[PDB]
């Protein structure tokens, strides 16, 4: 979750 | 966002060599989620002289020494300052950059790295860089495009003559509209949005959002329960017509499949028969017509009707011709109620009337509709989000324009929806959406609400389809809704 | 049961500090099946001067030493003999007791036991008591009441002022009617039962029940294997109009699905074509109508049919005018059958009637419907069974009055059903309901066993949907059914 | 790697808050790795003056928006410039700092990250700074240090007075010497090596390493398929002695289990039996002795049987007395073959035999033997690799001083073995990695290498065991060898 | 059963 | 195997 | 655990 949204 | 990351160093201070850094190792990261282990690859990296290419310089040196072959091809004119100094690290790593592309270069790599454009592309790529475009668009290697795919035009999602086809692109802090609208969002491929470091109060400054399912679930309504039929609201369905006797049967399934306590139907006789014996559950009022089409003599019964609910859908299946023209006006004009309006009701609409209510009205056209409704060509309405803005804030309404993106505005918010498949290109498949709409704000959703959970929730019911998407139809579509419900939670 | 309590210490001798601490270690080994291991937790038990919460204190020494931490607040003003008696040994085997509440003090504990007020409750809780259970209801702690959550009035399920919200209610003897009854079986959260000493036979000479599994397996009509369809029973249902043709279907089915061997309906043509369009195995016989409703000239027409059938339903989708008053009321007059009278038939239904009738009846009204048939408000008559009861008294009927929880009387006994979920608050619920019951009915059944019958497999139908319980429809409900049959045995 | 650091910036012209960024992220990822999602937790995070403290401001600001509560506490007097930078920015993103420790102040946070001192630890932590230490190795929270836990000397592996427990530990390029020697080795906890940006060059120019894996499996010889025996080497052991009949068994099936062809023992009569009655695929040859140990009339014949085979181990349970001693050192200094000397050969040892000979050796002692080797304390050479490094240097020689974690040396080139358990700690265990060692050289690996294998495959033995390790035994111990070996391809 | 009803 | 030794 | 050791 905290480097990337998907 | 260009917004954003002027405010990130101007005011909040983050030196934008640190932004660029965290950009380009998202870029590695994201290569190793979807690729596994890197070491085995080698990467053609194609570099502007932009930041889009400095940030393919930082993805490139972080290649060296783990990487079979790493290789940038510069084909920028000149470097901006955060460019020219990552290009400097490269070297002074010991990358080897060319200025040449041969068309067969190709051939020596496993990955291409496509940092030429991001959204400071103006205008059409022509010359080399389109010939590069096409030679990549046509390698069968694999294409990880930093931002945006060069050439897709950030703020429309259109195709600047051309643009680099994408298996997977990375873009930073938040997706952009190219990414959202087509054809962007068809050359973007997997879509990653890395965090770089901008502070979380801008990220969610932005005003345009795509629509997620923790969106979703935190809109559904609660079922307390100790609840009955008028808890959850009445809706009164004005369709059908002695041509399209099976409209109002699917927007009435719509309304019920979403968990609204009552639907009522009015139809012209005998039509109006067919959607209880599809469902019995639903209430279907016979209307005496003297044509087999609503008219200004119905318009009393009509109104006397929604006396009873708390939303009116009407237009599916209703025919356009004067006398349906009177009768749609004359009620909306009349009806102090929220009106979710479609299909044949917004092609005789008089917008003069939109303007007039006091109550609130969701539309919900696709772009032929919309198109006739403004007389503009559909060229200019198709994914035209400031057009849907202005109309909706001009006419105190939702409008929902419907396309493989949707677009929901209410003039200062606006949402996109990318849910769903190419089953819901037929007949029928609207009219299930008006239904859920109107359901929706049935249940104490706001025109707004209403509308962002149906179009998610419609979409999504598709995806849900367990044969191939093309055979889907409306019925099976109003089955699979309740399992989309379940899923969101 | 304050009865039974009495009747236990006063005439059969069990001291009453024997019930209490019975009582007190109930609850221990309900929190023990509930949370696994209790020793990693630490307890805040608040205690009033009742009983209650001498049962409080009971569990809270029961605790001491087994638990990381115990905590008992005493919020009364003075204790009874027995919470007195408890009290002195909580604080002689150790027990920390404080009298002073400080907002913060839940930040130090992971479970509340709320033993404040139970069935001695009167009136409305203000001052500190409430401003703690709100603080309580604030917290997300998890919260265990002893005997019913403080605030909930035990003979009618009412919240007075404020009440404690449970994840885990933990009675003696019997539920209670404000554990069954809206909102208190809401404010319960997970309820057990513990037997803590009281005669099997005073257990079971209340008289009013919760209708259970067992009950129903035992109620359920034998199928013996030499049979043939008049062996089941037959059903005709007088129902439908031109405006509602759909109820007719729903209830028709209703009876057809719980095993009855023949249903006839008599229904305003052409609409009785619906039916078997939708389902051939009914009989739908056209009645002939001046306007699309019933009236008297159907009368005798209606009576004949009556002669060859064993129960008759009359009423969902009549409508109500003059003519439908006239004809329905004529009818029952006339009719030598078990009658189960629903939706319209209610609403135009002369009471006189009822009482001149040798034949027994049946009622299905949801609280609207009770509302208008005594002329009282909705929230006179909702929950209501002591009016239920004199209803069904003077009346000589059993009266079904629908609602989350829904109650079944005769006038003598007085059954609750808790089975259903939000899903049958949508139209066409109430029709399958009225054809179960009828079906029963014809099948044996008396009125009372029939409707017992009914409402718990119509709830269980809906527990089976597959999917989100929103999206369940009368027509999905009418395919769980034998599901719902099925897994009784 | 204060030295890589340097270079990094200063010569590749990395921007130093470039590469305190990236530290800080790695510290991020490396948390969410080992928690899952960190967005339900509260992070406390400790922060000195130093660069270490900047990159705990780099952590800080990262999780602000993204998790529950943050909160750094500054412990530091003044600020180095990129710890103030990342301090200005964790300040203007809206973080909350203060520079007052509460001893309750954990009470309110679920994650410690401590980021008071890195590599620029001088000197015993007192006063403030000792007191939250101590208060945060008693609270039990998880704790997450940056770089090295603070107390550590990341050059010793030394505790200076006091140093923070570590659940995990993120380190930036390589290990430090303080991760892999004890007691830093046991307070790291979890060790992650995060790569913040270092040209690969550098981070391989170090000179000490870890033994992994992968190194294991690339120095393990190779088993051509047409071979014998004597492909494959030939070792004699020299050991044993009345009182010690079991050692030359286990160091001989040591040198068979890695894989040798031919093991010859020479151990005094009738002790020499033994080792056939367990293994009969050894040779054990009698040595007639006057008293039961080896002594110079056995010089010749030693040498003698020393002529067929590629390597000699020898020490093993030989006894430690005049006799021995004049045997021993009369024999390495003819021998002029490959020596491994272990135990009471080391014991008896005259240093200046080990200058004079052309061939290798490999000495293998445990602190205590290093000690009255060099004439030394324990504690000045447990775990003093500059004092190994000299030692093998000066006496051309490579010496594996054993303990936890293993430090192997040429006097060039030092590597430490971290595989193992406690297991190994009891007699016989030794015995086998001096036969391991032998069989390795036998097979044609240099010293080293032969070395390093062994040091490695001998602990991963141990871990392999599948019950208890303290109930290990040199017997299982060799049994587990081939596990160890398949296990490493 | 002996001791709860669920 | 990029961001981590372990 | 409560009401038992076994
Ligand atoms: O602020 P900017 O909008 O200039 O951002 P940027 O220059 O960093 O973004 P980009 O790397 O795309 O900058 C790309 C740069 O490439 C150049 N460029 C833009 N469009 C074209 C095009 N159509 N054909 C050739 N070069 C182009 C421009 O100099 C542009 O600034
Ligand atoms: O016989 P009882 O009905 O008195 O039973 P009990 O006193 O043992 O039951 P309870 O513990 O609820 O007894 C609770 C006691 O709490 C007190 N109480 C009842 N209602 C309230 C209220 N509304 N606010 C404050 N105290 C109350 C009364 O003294 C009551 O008897
Ligand atoms: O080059 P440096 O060795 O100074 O590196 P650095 O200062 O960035 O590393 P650190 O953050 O550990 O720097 C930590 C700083 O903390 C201070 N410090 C070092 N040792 C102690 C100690 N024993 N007690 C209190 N403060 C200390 C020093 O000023 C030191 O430079
Ligand atoms: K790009
Ligand atoms: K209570
Ligand atoms: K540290």
Same mark, same amino acid.
């Given at each position: 979750?905290?480097?990337?949204?998907? | 966002?260009?917004?954003?990351?002027?405010?990130?160093?101007?005011?909040?201070?983050?030196?934008?060599?640190?932004?660029?850094?965290?950009?380009?190792?998202?870029?590695?990261?994201?290569?190793?989620?979807?690729?596994?282990?890197?070491?085995? #690859?080698?990467?053609?990296? *194609?570099?502007?002289?932009?930041?889009?290419?400095?940030?393919?310089?930082?993805?490139?040196?972080?290649?060296?020494?783990?990487?079979?072959?790493?290789?940038?091809?510069?084909?920028?004119?000149?470097?901006?300052?955060?460019?020219?100094?990552?290009?400097? *690290?490269?070297?002074?790593?010991?990358?080897?950059?060319?200025?040449?592309?041969?068309?067969?270069?190709?051939?020596?790599?496993?990955?291409?790295?496509?940092?030429?454009?991001?959204?400071?592309?103006?205008?059409?790529?022509?010359?080399? $860089?389109?010939?590069?475009?096409?030679?990549?668009?046509?390698?069968?290697?694999?294409?990880?495009?930093?931002?945006?795919?060069?050439?897709?035009?950030?703020?429309?999602?259109?195709?600047?003559?051309?643009?680099?086809?994408?298996? +997977?692109?990375?873009?930073?802090?938040?997706?952009?509209?190219?990414?959202?609208?087509?054809?962007?969002?068809? *050359?973007?491929?997997?879509?990653?949005?890395?965090?770089?470091?901008?502070?979380?109060?801008?990220?969610?400054?932005?005003?345009? $959002?795509?629509?997620?399912?923790?969106?979703?679930?935190?809109?559904?309504?609660?079922?307390? &329960?100790?609840?009955?039929?008028?808890? #959850?609201?009445?809706? *009164? /369905?004005?369709?059908?017509?002695?041509? $399209?006797?099976?409209?109002?049967?699917?927007?009435?399934?719509?309304?019920?499949?979403?968990?609204?306590?009552?639907?009522?139907?009015?139809?012209?006789?005998?039509?109006?028969?067919?959607?209880?014996?599809?469902?019995?559950?639903?209430?279907?009022?016979?209307?005496?017509?003297?044509?087999?089409?609503?008219?200004?003599? !119905?318009?009393?019964?009509?109104?006397?009707?929604?006396?009873?609910?708390?939303?009116?859908?009407?237009?599916?299946?209703?025919? !356009?011709?004067?006398?349906?023209?009177?009768?749609?006006?004359?009620?909306?004009? =009349?009806?102090?109620?929220?009106?979710? /309006?479609?299909?044949?009701?917004? !092609?005789?609409?008089?917008?003069?009337?939109?303007?007039?209510?006091?109550?609130?009205?969701?539309?919900?056209?696709?772009?032929?509709?919309? @198109? &006739?409704?403004?007389?503009?060509?559909?060229?200019?309405?198709?994914?035209? #989000?400031?057009?849907?803005?202005?109309?909706?804030?001009?006419?105190?309404?939702?409008?929902? +324009?419907?396309?493989?993106?949707? /677009?929901?505005?209410?003039?200062?918010? =606006?949402?996109?929806?990318?849910?769903?498949?190419?089953?819901?290109?037929?007949?029928?498949?609207?009219?299930?959406?008006?239904?859920?709409?109107?359901?929706?704000?049935?249940?104490?959703?706001?025109?707004?609400?209403?509308?962002?959970?149906?179009? $998610?929730?419609?979409?999504?019911?598709?995806?849900?389809?367990?044969?191939?998407?093309?055979?889907?139809?409306?019925?099976?579509?109003?089955?699979?809704?309740?399992? @989309? /419900?379940? &899923?969101?939670?």
């Amino acid at each position: 979750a905290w480097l990337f949204e998907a | 966002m260009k917004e954003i990351d002027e405010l990130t160093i101007k005011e909040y201070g983050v030196d934008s060599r640190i932004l660029m850094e965290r950009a380009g190792i998202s870029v590695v990261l994201a290569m190793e989620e979807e690729l596994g282990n890197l070491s085995d #690859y080698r990467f053609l990296v *194609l570099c502007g002289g932009g930041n889009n290419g400095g940030d393919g310089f930082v993805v490139a040196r972080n290649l060296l020494g783990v990487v079979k072959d790493v290789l940038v091809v510069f084909l920028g004119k000149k470097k901006t300052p955060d460019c020219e100094y990552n290009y400097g *690290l490269y070297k002074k790593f010991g990358g080897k950059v060319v200025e040449q592309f041969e068309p067969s270069i190709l051939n020596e790599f496993d990955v291409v790295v496509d940092a030429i454009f991001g959204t400071g592309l103006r205008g059409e790529i022509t010359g080399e $860089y389109a010939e590069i475009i096409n030679l990549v668009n046509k390698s069968g290697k694999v294409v990880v495009s930093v931002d945006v795919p060069s050439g897709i035009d950030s703020n429309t999602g259109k195709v600047l003559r051309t643009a680099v086809k994408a298996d +997977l692109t990375v873009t930073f802090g938040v997706p952009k509209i190219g990414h959202i609208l087509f054809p962007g969002r068809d *050359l973007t491929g997997k879509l990653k949005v890395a965090n770089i470091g901008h502070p979380v109060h801008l990220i969610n400054s932005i005003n345009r $959002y795509v629509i997620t399912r923790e969106m979703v679930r935190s809109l559904l309504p609660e079922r307390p &329960r100790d609840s009955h039929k008028g808890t #959850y609201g009445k809706v *009164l /369905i004005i369709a059908g017509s002695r041509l $399209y006797s099976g409209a109002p049967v699917l927007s009435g399934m719509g309304s019920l499949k979403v968990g609204t306590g009552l639907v009522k139907l009015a139809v012209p006789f005998p039509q109006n028969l067919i959607a209880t014996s599809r469902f019995p559950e639903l209430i279907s009022v016979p209307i005496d017509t003297e044509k087999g089409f609503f008219s200004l003599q !119905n318009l009393q019964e009509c109104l006397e009707l929604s006396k009873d609910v708390d939303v009116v859908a009407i237009g599916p299946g209703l025919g !356009n011709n004067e006398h349906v023209r009177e009768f749609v006006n004359e009620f909306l004009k =009349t009806l102090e109620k929220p009106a979710v /309006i479609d299909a044949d009701a917004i !092609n005789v609409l008089d917008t003069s009337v939109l303007k007039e209510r006091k109550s609130p009205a969701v539309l919900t056209p696709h772009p032929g509709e919309m @198109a &006739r409704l403004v007389k503009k060509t559909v060229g200019d309405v198709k994914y035209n #989000y400031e057009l849907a803005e202005e109309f909706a804030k001009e006419n105190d309404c939702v409008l929902v +324009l419907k396309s493989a993106t949707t /677009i929901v505005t209410d003039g200062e918010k =606006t949402l996109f929806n990318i849910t769903g498949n190419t089953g819901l290109s037929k007949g029928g498949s609207g009219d299930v959406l008006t239904g859920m709409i109107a359901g929706f704000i049935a249940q104490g959703l706001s025109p707004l609400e209403a509308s962002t959970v149906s179009v $998610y929730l419609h979409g999504f019911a598709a995806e849900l389809f367990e044969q191939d998407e093309r055979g889907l139809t409306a019925s099976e579509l109003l089955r699979l809704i309740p399992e @989309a /419900i379940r &899923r969101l939670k």
